[PDB]
Design a protein around this ligand. Structure first.
Ligand code: MNR
Ligand SMILES: [K+]
Length: 405
């Protein structure tokens, strides 16, 4: 359904793009969003879909908006408006200056230092899961590796039982790619229903897990409140269950279709870290936004207080003005430009954990299964939303070409 066009929006800027079900989705989700960068499309357009909102389509505008938090606020960062209004995670729903004090605490539980505490476990789990699949000559990558690898690592860090994964994963997905059975607000309340008692129990009897550290932490010298701890832990759950999980499938799908790129990383393994960055650019998948704090003229367009604007962190990397031959994957790309981990004061705090999970996967998978392909007659389907993903990824290979080491 298309919402009525607001009085200040001119017709020539209307482009009815649906972020939850794009028209050209069959060609690939990244390709689907790239239609917003064709020759006849303005830098900033308005879509009547999902309640009506603006969409920045070029890296220059996306970076400018993320830097100017005075005009573009994180208080209501999700579309539709109902979801953005209910959204209250910390630090993501706050603007500086209040936002800043919470970043240090989050860094304590998912930052670089922590990646060092789980180094061995991450390595062990990756090798373990891959060796188990190797002799099978086939797998359903999404459920056999993409989900269990990053998710089990997060549950370990948070001190939560793996048997709770099905419930938590379902709730997290309703906040990014809703199936219609739950609103954002209902999904968020169910997540908080889960966390509330756990936070109280760990504030009474502290442990060394991520939830215990957040719940008993301090914010710029003063005790964190139960409510603040809940709002921060909810965000961590989403990041642990619906970020790397999706990205890994986009990357493996590409490697399955490009033997040449697989051979490159096999012959020259020192290029894996660079390959990670290039894949993060080409298969970017996050797209959230901001809300206007007042009337404001932006790049010749009149914006009104209350208007929502989607800043596809995904679009910066595919912008031909930022990267030549954007759809082409080149591991030797000199200057890989992108905003896959955000831009400005809210730069991703989990990027170190994410990069380690991606690099370990690339190295340990190609070491054991260098040659693989998409299953016979399979047509890979993608899904779009706040975070985009892959519905299923059936893979096959000849065990005779594999290595058990
Ligand atoms: C479990 C931890 C996390 C993991 C894993 C993780 C993995 C990834 C990842 C992997 C492929 C994707 C791409 C990703 C992308 C992002 N991520 Mn990340 N992220 N990520 C966070 C935790 C995590 N992320 C936190 C915390 C913030 C918010 C910081 C702040 O608001 O000040 C954040 C913020 C962000 C933002 C900024 C959003 C904004 O400006 O409103 C983007 C984009
Ligand atoms: K809000």
């Amino acid at each position: 359904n298309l919402a009525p066009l607001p009085p200040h929006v001119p017709e020539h800027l209307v482009f009815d793009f649906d972020m939850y079900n794009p028209s050209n989705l069959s060609a690939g989700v990244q390709e689907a969003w790239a239609v917003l960068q064709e020759s006849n499309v303005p830098d900033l357009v308005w879509t009547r879909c999902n309640g009506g909102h603006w969409i920045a389509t070029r890296g220059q505008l996306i970076r400018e908006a993320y830097e100017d938090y005075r005009h573009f606020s994180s208080e209501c960062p999700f579309i539709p408006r109902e979801a953005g209004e209910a959204y209250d995670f910390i630090p993501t729903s706050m603007d500086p200056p209040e936002q800043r004090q919470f970043r240090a605490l989050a860094n304590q539980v998912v930052g670089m230092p922590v990646v060092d505490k789980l180094e061995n476990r991450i390595q062990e789990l990756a090798c373990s899961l891959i060796e188990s699949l190797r002799p099978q000559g086939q797998c359903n990558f999404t459920e056999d590796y993409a989900e269990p690898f990053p998710i089990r690592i997060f549950m370990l860090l948070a001190g939560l039982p793996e048997e709770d994964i099905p419930h938590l994963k379902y709730l997290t997905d309703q906040m990014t790619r809703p199936d219609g059975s739950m609103t954002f607000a209902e999904a968020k309340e169910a997540l908080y229903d889960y966390l509330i008692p756990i936070i109280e129990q760990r504030r009474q009897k502290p442990g060394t897990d991520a939830i215990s550290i957040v719940a008993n932490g301090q914010v710029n010298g003063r005790p964190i409140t139960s409510d603040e701890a809940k709002r921060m832990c909810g965000l961590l759950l989403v990041g642990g269950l619906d970020t790397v999980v999706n990205f890994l499938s986009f990357s493996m799908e590409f490697l399955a279709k490009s033997p040449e790129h697989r051979q490159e990383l096999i012959e020259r393994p020192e290029r894996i870290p660079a390959a990670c960055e290039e894949l993060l650019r080409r298969f970017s998948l996050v797209a959230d936004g901001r809300i206007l704090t007042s009337d404001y003229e932006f790049h010749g367009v009149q914006l009104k207080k209350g208007d929502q604007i989607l800043l596809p962190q995904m679009l910066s990397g595919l912008d031909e003005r930022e990267n030549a031959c954007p759809m082409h994957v080149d591991f030797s790309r000199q200057k890989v430009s992108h905003t896959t981990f955000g831009h400005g004061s809210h730069l991703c705090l989990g990027q170190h954990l994410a990069r380690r999970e991606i690099i370990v996967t690339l190295k340990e998978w190609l070491t054991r299964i260098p040659d693989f392909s998409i299953a016979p007659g399979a047509q890979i389907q993608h899904k779009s939303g706040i975070v985009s993903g892959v519905q299923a990824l059936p893979l096959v290979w000849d065990p005779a070409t594999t290595k058990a080491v």
